[PDB]
């Protein structure tokens, strides 16, 4: 239905990061999934440009794409990584790794 | 090619806003168009979650969508609008109406 946060468990080996991220093996990154269509749910905050673009898409669907459901706020995680020197070091707040909020943009 | 700002001229009559926005008739809203794929251009700032999701999409294309090219910063415009009382009033900075920057999210 509407744009919302859903589960996405990410494995660092599968994306080629295990050479440098020791632990954890996986983490919950989440993803934003769903449509950007009218009517909109009242528990989410849209931008005016996303509203305008969605309306323009309705009138000219071949020429203008619809707004996209994307992460609008991100949260950090902690990773145990391999530094340039190669020693296991803790990165306490590795920013931007997990979805906090979703929204149409 | 890559995610970038392109022209999108929006007509308020075409989107049903002319009942309340008197002037201007049209304005340059811009849109964000292009792909979110590796390698990425060095004149843009990606988020870690968008990078991770794009990598996961490559490994599992049917299960996880790619990051989306969206506006990451918006600019205001000035509109002459019809207030509840119905008198033409200037809104000097109507926020969020035009694309300032694009990015993969
Ligand atoms: Cl609505
Ligand atoms: Cl939204
Ligand atoms: Cl806005
Ligand atoms: Cl803490
Ligand atoms: Cl930290
Ligand atoms: Cl790259
Ligand atoms: Cl980007
Ligand atoms: Cl980030
Ligand atoms: Cl000014
Ligand atoms: Cl204002
Ligand atoms: Na069309
Ligand atoms: Na797949």
Curated annotation (Swiss-Prot), chains A, B:
Residues 78-92 are annotated as: Interaction with ENG. A reversible disulfide bond can be formed between the two subunits in the homodimer; this has no effect on GDF2 activity. Detected in blood plasma (at protein level). Disulfide bonds join 3-69, 32-102, 36-104. It is found in: Secreted. It comes from the Eukaryota. Belongs to the TGF-beta family. It is linked to Telangiectasia, hereditary hemorrhagic, 5: A multisystemic vascular dysplasia leading to dilation of permanent blood vessels and arteriovenous malformations of skin, mucosa, and viscera. The disease is characterized by recurrent epistaxis and gastro-intestinal hemorrhage. Visceral involvement includes arteriovenous malformations of the lung, liver, and brain. Potent circulating inhibitor of angiogenesis. Signals through the type I activin receptor ACVRL1 but not other Alks. Signaling through SMAD1 in endothelial cells requires TGF-beta coreceptor endoglin/ENG. Homodimer; disulfide-linked. Detected in extracellular fluid as mature homodimer, and in complex with its propeptide. Interacts with ACVRL1, BMPR2 and ACVR2B with high affinity (in vitro). Identified in a complex with ACVRL1 and ACVR2B. Has ten times lower affinity for ACVR2A (in vitro). Interacts with ENG, forming a heterotetramer with a 2:2 stoichiometry. Can form a heteromeric complex with ENG and ACVRL1. Interacts with type I receptor ACVR1. This is Growth/differentiation factor 2. The chain holds residues 325 to 429 of 429 of the full protein.
């Amino acid at each position: 239905s509407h744009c919302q946060k859903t589960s996405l468990r990410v494995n660092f080996e599968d994306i080629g990061w295990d050479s440098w991220i020791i632990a954890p093996k996986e983490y919950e990154a989440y993803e934003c999934k769903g449509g950007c269509f009218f009517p909109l749910a009242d528990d989410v905050t849209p931008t005016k440009h996303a509203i305008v673009q969605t309306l323009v898409h309705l009138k000219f669907p071949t020429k203008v794409s619809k707004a996209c459901c994307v992460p609008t706020k991100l949260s950090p995680i902690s990773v145990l990584y391999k530094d340039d020197m190669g020693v296991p070091t803790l990165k306490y707040h590795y920013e931007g790794m997990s979805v906090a909020e979703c929204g149409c943009r």
